Design a protein around this nucleic acid. Sequence first.
DNA 1: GCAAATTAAAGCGCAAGA
DNA 2: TCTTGCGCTTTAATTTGC
Length: 139
Amino acid sequence: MKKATCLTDDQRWQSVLARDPNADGEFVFAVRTTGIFCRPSCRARHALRENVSFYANASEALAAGFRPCKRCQPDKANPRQHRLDKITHACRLLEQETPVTLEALADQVAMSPFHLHRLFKATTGMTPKAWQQAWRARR
DNA sequence: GCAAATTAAAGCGCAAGA
DNA sequence: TCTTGCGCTTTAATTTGC
Ligand SMILES: [Zn+2]
């Protein structure tokens, strides 16, 4: 809602402060005071808008000569929901074959199949192996 | 200007329960 | 035999001071 020429940095900031996961991935915000640029929903802490600018992507911010927040850089912004769509597919595999399939996931994060469920809840937000079971019950 | 210290939050690991 | 909830720790970034 209310979008300037594809960069209402004014509300983008309202998104950065509002931690709107819907502006995450769409733009970043670079605080020159610290030389960092986070997503609109950074979970570490914040600096005034003053030294804060916005970028279409983290690479643009990365191009401003800033250090991407190790909290907002490794995780996914709007791409977050897309990586969560991938996990749902993980549910299919856990109900598609007979033996459960987490080996590719567990190896990717370096954790057991139960912790993969814990990740499914972390990203989805509140349902690890239970989200796997529900999806499988409706899929 | 440059640094250190603090606060905040997320997620991993552990446990217990069913 | 399998599962899920909760806690705590660690990580990270921000703020202020001189
Ligand atoms: Zn951040």
